[PDB]
Amino acid sequence: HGQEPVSYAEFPHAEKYLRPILDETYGIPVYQEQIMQIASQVAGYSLGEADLLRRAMGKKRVEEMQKHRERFVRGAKERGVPEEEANRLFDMLEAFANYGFN
Amino acid sequence: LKFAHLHQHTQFSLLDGAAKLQDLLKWVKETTPEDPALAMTDHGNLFGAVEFYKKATAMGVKPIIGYEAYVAAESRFDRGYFHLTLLAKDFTGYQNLVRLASRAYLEGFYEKPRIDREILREHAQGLIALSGCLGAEIPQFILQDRLDLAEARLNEDLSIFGDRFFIEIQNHGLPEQKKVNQVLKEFARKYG
Numbered sequence: 001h002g003q004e005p006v007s008y009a010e011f012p013h014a015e016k017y018l019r020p021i022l023d024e025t026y027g028i029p030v031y032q033e034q035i036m037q038i039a040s041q042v043a044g045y046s047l048g049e050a051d052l053l054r055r056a057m058g059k060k061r062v063e064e065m066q067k068h069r070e071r072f073v074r075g076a077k078e079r080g081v082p083e084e085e086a087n088r089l090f091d092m093l094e095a096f097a098n099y100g101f102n
Numbered sequence: 103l104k105f106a107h108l109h110q111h112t113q114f115s116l117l118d119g120a121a122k123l124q125d126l127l128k129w130v131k132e133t134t135p136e137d138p139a140l141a142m143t144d145h146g147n148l149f150g151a152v153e154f155y156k157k158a159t160a161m162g163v164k165p166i167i168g169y170e171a172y173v174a175a176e177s178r179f180d181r182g183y184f185h186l187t188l189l190a191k192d193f194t195g196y197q198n199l200v201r202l203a204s205r206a207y208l209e210g211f212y213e214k215p216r217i218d219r220e221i222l223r224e225h226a227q228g229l230i231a232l233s234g235c236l237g238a239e240i241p242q243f244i245l246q247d248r249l250d251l252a253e254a255r256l257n258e259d260l261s262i263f264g265d266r267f268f269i270e271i272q273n274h275g276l277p278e279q280k281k282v283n284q285v286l287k288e289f290a291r292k293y294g
């Protein structure tokens with residue numbers, strides 16, 4: 001309705017990656033493709049590997065998720081984020097991955 | 103800038119130990135000529151202690167009689183367990199390692215020979231403890247996202263050993279060690 005700034009103050013360094021994707025849907029990662037795009041841009045991930053990363057969250061494997069967390073942070077630091085946001089971004093992505101629609 | 107393994111398993115670790123007593127000491131000798139040291143730490147046993155001591159000293163390497171104890175979750179009478187590296191400070195510590203070993207088999211044997219933090223406190227005199235591998239208590243609570251228990255458990259061990267307790271840090275190609283060693287680095291820094 002044009003009654004809340006869709007801000008990204010939680011992830012200031014990741015804002016420039018988050019906006020172009022999530023401004024179409026007012027900041028809420030509703031679709032699966034948006035989580036793949038975030039993953040691919042923020043973490044320097046392959047778009048094809050971002051498809052795999054969605055399935056790993058869907059499967060929610062016990063300790064195999066920590067392999068991706070490490071992978072995500074390694075790329076994340078190389079792009080812009082200070083590795084305080086990258087881990088908490090992964091918390092957001094995994095959380096909205098459960099109800100992510102095609 | 104030199105190194106000395108304090109957590110090493112020999113052939114006397116009957117299940118998973120593959121390192122023979124002879125060829126191990128010469129590798130440690132050939133790698134580090136200047137004051138070589140090696141610690142025998144085997145899984146819930148002290149079989150090689152005497153043979154390791156007299157062969158190490160025969161090669162000019164200083165032996166450190168260790169013991170990777172299986173520590174029970176609560177009590178040793180409970181019928182899983184946790185890892186914990188213990189190192190002998192002096193001869194009193196050697197006698198205390200011999201007792202903890204003995205009570206592991208005699209009293210607290212369920213699947214492995216297990217010990218307790220009760221009896222560890224009883225025979226803590228002369229033991230340098232380390233935090234242990236991923237299979238140990240504090241690192242396992244960190245993996246469970248229960249930092250309050252990890253720290254609580256850290257306080258319990260610090261009441262036992264005091265200034266003899268240390269934070270064991272080991273790194274292979276494993277993502278679980280990055281989360282643990284990070285949280286252990288904070289604990290290491292918080293409690294002096």
Ligand SMILES: [Zn+2]
Pocket residue numbers: 170185235237238
């Ligand atoms: Zn172990």
